Write a protein that binds this ligand. Sequence first.
Ligand code: ADP
Lengths: 73, 509, 106, 516, 190, 502
Amino acid sequence: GRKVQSGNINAAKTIADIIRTCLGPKSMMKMLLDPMGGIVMTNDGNAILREIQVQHPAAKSMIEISRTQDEEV
Amino acid sequence: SSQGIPQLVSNISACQVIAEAVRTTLGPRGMDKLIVDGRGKATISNDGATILKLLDVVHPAAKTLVDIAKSQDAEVGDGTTSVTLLAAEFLKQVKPYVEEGLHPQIIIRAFRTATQLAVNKIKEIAVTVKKADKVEQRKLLEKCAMTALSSKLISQQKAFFAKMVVDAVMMLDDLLQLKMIGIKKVQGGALEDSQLVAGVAFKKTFSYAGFEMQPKKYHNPKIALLNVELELKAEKDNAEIRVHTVEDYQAIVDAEWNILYDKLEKIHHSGAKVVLSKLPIGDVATQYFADRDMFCAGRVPEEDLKRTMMACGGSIQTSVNALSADVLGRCQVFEETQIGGERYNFFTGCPKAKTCTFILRGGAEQFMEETERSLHDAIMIVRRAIKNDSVVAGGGAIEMELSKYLRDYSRTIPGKQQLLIGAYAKALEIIPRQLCDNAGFDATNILNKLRARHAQGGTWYGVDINNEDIADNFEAFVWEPAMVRINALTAASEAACLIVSVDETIKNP
Amino acid sequence: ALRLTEYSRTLSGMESYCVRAFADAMEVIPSTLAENAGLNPISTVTELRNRHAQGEKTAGINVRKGGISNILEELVVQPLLVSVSALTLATETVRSILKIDDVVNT
Amino acid sequence: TIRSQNVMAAASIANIVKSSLGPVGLDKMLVDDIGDVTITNDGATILKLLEVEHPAAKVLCELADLQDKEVGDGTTSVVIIAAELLKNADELVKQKIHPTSVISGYRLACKEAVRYINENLIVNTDELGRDCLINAAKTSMSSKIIGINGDFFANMVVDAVLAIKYTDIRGQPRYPVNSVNILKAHGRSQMESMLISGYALNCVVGSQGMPKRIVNAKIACLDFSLQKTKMKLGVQVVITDPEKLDQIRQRESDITKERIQKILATGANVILTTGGIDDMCLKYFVEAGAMAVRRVLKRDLKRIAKASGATILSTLANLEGEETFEAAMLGQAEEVVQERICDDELILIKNTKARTSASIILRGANDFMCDEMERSLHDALCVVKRVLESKSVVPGGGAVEAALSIYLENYATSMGSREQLAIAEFARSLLVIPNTLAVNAAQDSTDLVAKLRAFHNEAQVNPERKNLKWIGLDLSNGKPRDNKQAGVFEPTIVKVKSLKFATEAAITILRIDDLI
Amino acid sequence: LMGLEALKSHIMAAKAVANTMRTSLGPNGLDKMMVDKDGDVTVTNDGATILSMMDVDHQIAKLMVELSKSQDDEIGDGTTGVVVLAGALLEEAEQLLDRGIHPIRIADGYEQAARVAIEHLDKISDSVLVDIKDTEPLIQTAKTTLGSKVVNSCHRQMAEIAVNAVLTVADMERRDVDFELIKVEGKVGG
Amino acid sequence: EAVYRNIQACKELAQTTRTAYGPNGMNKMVINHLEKLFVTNDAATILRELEVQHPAAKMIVMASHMQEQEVGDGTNFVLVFAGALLELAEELLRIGLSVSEVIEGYEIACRKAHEILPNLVCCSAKNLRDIDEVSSLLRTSIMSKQYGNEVFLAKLIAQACVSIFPDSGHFNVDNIRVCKILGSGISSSSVLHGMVFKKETEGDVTSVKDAKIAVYSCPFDGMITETKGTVLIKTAEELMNFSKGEENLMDAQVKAIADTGANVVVTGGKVADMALHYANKYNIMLVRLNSKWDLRRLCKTVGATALPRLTPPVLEEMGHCDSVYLSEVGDTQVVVFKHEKEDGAISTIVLRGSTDNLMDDIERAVDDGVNTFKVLTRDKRLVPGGGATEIELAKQITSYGETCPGLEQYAIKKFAEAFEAIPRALAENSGVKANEVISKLYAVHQEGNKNVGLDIEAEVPAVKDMLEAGILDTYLGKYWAIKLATNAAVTVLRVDQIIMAK
Ligand SMILES: Nc1ncnc2c1ncn2[C@@H]1O[C@H](COP(=O)(O)OP(=O)(O)O)[C@@H](O)[C@H]1O
């Protein structure tokens, strides 16, 4: 249980906590605060994933494997 | 540093801190210690037990370490520092292993198993070199002692100390004795004159008269011991009422000295000849003894007083009166002789036989201020040679035998315990390592030589204390008794396991 | 170092003490050759001094091993000119260096 | 902190590459640049890719890459062994041991260790492998077991490697792993698989108007392809002739009657031809008997050329058929069968001369698991090939690093000089390979290294137990196994050079004193 | 605190003692001024008197001054010589420790150095003629040794009285005497 | 928030107390307000010194004290098990379940455990004679506190208890006292009928028949109510005159006050050695160097009572005994008072050892052994221990949780996992990784063996049957341990805030 796996898990938990509310017919709206000043609304998780900033390399690799998932199906 | 591994690391670090204050002291020619604490006064000592007693062990791990180490009492050999350093180096060699997340109880089991195997190995290989019938064992006791002090200049006086130590073997024949080891410091003259005298000897005498006017061949003197002063009356006493009785100014102390004269008559017809006391005695009293067939030997330290009272089988008095009883014994002969530059006193024989001593000349400080520790240790050596049946080669030779046996038996054990047994065997190496380091010449080379000389051939090889290179410590009669080393090694192992097996130290304010 | 310590003993003035210091300085190179071998420098240098003070005027540290074995065969040898040039050039350099009080800019 | 600054950097590199030493090791994310995310678990790749920042790490990785370029793949073993040597050497130096004494120690330890391995720890392939290769392949299968299967595949691969034994100069008969004609097949009972001597092609089915249904004496190769169309070399349309534009192909087809006469004179009755040849062009040779087989591809071409010696471009140079055909490109063999096996009409060239290749039909229900067994069996073929490389092999799974640790420990006390403590410290350092292989398994390193080292000491001290020389950890498990009766093997040359280069690295980086 | 650095600190304390005893030995030595808390001031060349009240600064200096004080009856003139010689021993010992030698080995090297020093020193000089009877070369010795330091002028009388006093008591104890029987009574006024 | 704080405090308390659980428990340093330093592995003492200032910690500690005063073993089981309850309740609350649901689930799970555990028992204690059998029954409790040297203490305790356990089905807790005279060798210990003392003033025992005891911490007078006589230490000659006086008063005691019950006077303060000689001449003994608890014990076991200051003796504080005689057990003088059930019901052992720390370790071992004997006498059925019973309960509670639909099942499952925490506590102390051994124990235990547990002796995590191995706890001990542990857990969980009042 080294710190690197803990960081991997923490990044996965953060991104999954962001995405969770987008599941189901009653899914929540999400807020995208582009530092230019505008806001992008979204209902589903792929749209928020395509432009969410992930500075942590673990979350970035999670995004890459999500890209690998979504390109297939 | 709260629970488990961090707290154990803190405890073993404290053990290392308290060990470094004693590790340098280990060895016969140990690099000694200076302690200032206790009243702001200096003291110099080359004994691990002494420096541990005078230093205060505030830390709990150090507290229990020194308690269990001194519980072995190290009366026979310098075992306090050996036990302390073995325990500390067990902890040192297991520090990384407990640090990497090793449960502190399998290590306790490892220490117990390794110690049991080491004890069995020592008892199996210890040689019972003591033939009882043949009396000429002196011809090897003398060699053992002279080699225990082979470092200093021994042209022919080696034989004199040899005869001293062996005749002291038959002189401390009965039981384990503590006065016998002290030797009276003498200043001036050559070192040739060194002869045994029974009983006790006393320090520098004052300029009191009666040195020979009353012959110093007291035959069967009854012994007197004192704890109350007889003093001069130079201080003035006031009596001013009238001038008719100018003699009354001194009659007040004349009455006191008449009472003391009655007490001295009580002593005189009680048969007591020589009076011992802790405190200086007035000159007038000294001449009273000189005239009245008795003698003054006061202002002597209490160690000689307990020495003499257990010589005579009596007790202290804490009084000047009520001495007309068997509270004191009867020595055969008292003599006082001018030896070198100072007049000394003697009680040869006394009534009992557990009391004797020896006279040490040489006209120097170096070799005899050394003696007060070195021949202390050397007649201790011969006492281990006499009164312990089996012996094993000292100077770390047995430590290398264990560092080989326990290490290979570790590499034999299948379980994870084997690595810990190997660390244990490595920790045994500190005694030759530290003993070599305190002798100055580099420890690493000597340890490599000991490693390579073991595992093939003779096992008795160890550090040659007198020289730089290696030698058979057993052949040089530098022995350590089997039983005492079993107790020391077991005590060190118990100290190590007791330190390892404790979690947080808790205290309530 | 041995013979020149003897010479400084026979010499007079502060020059004698300085020549003794010359010998004590030069004993560094055998010490550091030992300190680049397995042997501890101090024991090696004192052993070499004792050997040269007991005859055996050629003893040192070789390359084929680390111990003091230079009686013959495995001994490492050089033409003296390299050593005497080392001495002469180093002595001239230290003469120049101590010959200085200050370094001035033009 | 002038030498420890180098030792700690090397130890950090070892710590990074450590968690991926064995086949069960973890994955490493290496990013030499932003966004270039890479995930590999073989330490050699990360060492080639990890951007070291300290010159000690620079030189250690340079020596690791030099070892990789020299022989084998033991780069990981080199790095961890060398850096553990460095950590323990710095521990020795902290104990006032002089650095060059440790240098001489490690040098002599490496020499004596190489001697020990060469003289009593190598086991020879001419003694080994008659049956043990079956269980070695089983161990290779253990990584990707997909059911009760695996024992039959072990017999399959061992019989193949015996059959595909590449008789060659220097008496070192190993085969190229890619040569074998492994073939995935669906609609099959996947727990069987047949092996047939001779290479196999991407055989034509459902269009064989050519009567390849009968046995052939010899096969002829052809990487040309006569065509009505400008898809391949030799066909041109720039000619200014309404006839010649079409009958260039017809003239070539009539000229190839000479070529088929040549192949018949050589011994061939069927000629195989690469893609792009017309089926109506195949009819011309079907009518004359020397029929032509379509759809053989570049991999088929290279397999045919390397196995049967069918060097098509040996004497034939232009696309025209007027040039000389001879045995220089004949598919030299004894006979060629085209039997319908498992609803597939595979073409098998029995007893291919100048290289006796074989064909593998990998029976499997689905594409993904077919590719998975292909990968696993390729790994098994590679591991048995690596065993066969050196003609002499040592027990893998860390048995050597453990056994050799005990011998170096014993041989340290054999000598008195200061180097022997370095000998001993190296002996205990070399156990890092068993330690790492154990850590990479869920079973703790201490207990398993202890059991391993005790077994090896039993082999060293109880001479009756000489078969105990080679118990090591299972690479893909956490128990000590007899690594000849079963288990993995690794070539003696690659690991002895691994130890040698590890020691040379530990000398070159430890003789450093300061950077100025 | 511990080890060789602590021994270097001890060496610095010894140098503190040695450098102040350095200027005092010999007839031309520089005297110190001794001041007590009462403020009394006295100048003296005698190293023993200087060390009699030299207060501790770090403890090992107190230990060594007590060691030097303990031999005043036998050491005689040159006790400050003892102190400066030991200080030089420690000063060069610091260089030896810089060279890396363990302290006990330079210690036993110094004891064998003292041994060879004693062996050579027994052979260094000749013997004066008889003491008890003639006493005239002994008068010359006492003049050229004692009256040169600080007394207003060297003259025969103090030396002659001292040698007469000792020879009245010198021969009984096999050519030996104890100073318990000889004392000084200082009484200013003449 | 405060719930999580209380759970964290109790978690750290249970963690710092857990390391001493099991036979191979880890010792700890103890520094009480007497500043004496000793190492121990006993929950009772380690908590009695540890200032648990957190009120929840104090609640669990006093629940442990109530468990200890009701039943001997399990005082550390209560701590570790309540800690497990609170950690798993913190997990449930982090999931989001309310305190009410988890406490009600813990209550129903405790009721189920108390209902099913009597079915869990596998053996019952036979007759308490046959010192071998009762030794085998004390085996687990004796090994629990001290390890490495265990059979000797079991035999010692068995002999001590059986030699005094009456024919009636009753036995008293304040029966076995301990005497801790120093000396080499633990194995040199022995048992004596009645009470013994370590060492006192010398004397020739004349009270060997019809022994009676007086006890004074006041001037050594001992006059009868019908006369006046006293000793006043102001001058020597009349001090001897008094010494004669109160020696004659002691003679008058052994003559007439013996009918009330006074022959030998117990002195709290030291008396002159010459007065000891007079006591020798006139045939009266005495005892000296006794702590106030020693006087209390001696007087209560004879029916007497210590007098703080001078008062003529009356029947209200007289002591009765059968014999006062002497033995040199361990080569050292020890006095003994022997009874024939006139009062009796007391037996005392002598503790032998080279250190007061080991002396206290033996003391706690003896206390836990005698308390185990207590709880065995009134409940002769007793439970297979060493992790076996906790895991059998854990499996049963897991089955019950799967049997209970809806909510309350979280608390049932976590209560079973709290059971699971016990062999984890054994595993961490025994040097074996907890997860592997607990999983292997489930593997061998869900098969129905029902008596498997953590094998300490194996260096590798493994299991063995504790029934034939001799590791087995008391039924009532574990029953009340779990009962008050769950009571403490449910009470502490029912505190959502820590509030101060004046
Ligand atoms: N030989 C043993 N093996 C395994 N566990 C034991 C053994 N002996 C005792 N135990 C455990 O220890 C418990 C009792 O000891 P412990 O709780 O540590 O101290 P105390 O009895 O004072 O509360 C028992 O309930 C049992 O679970």
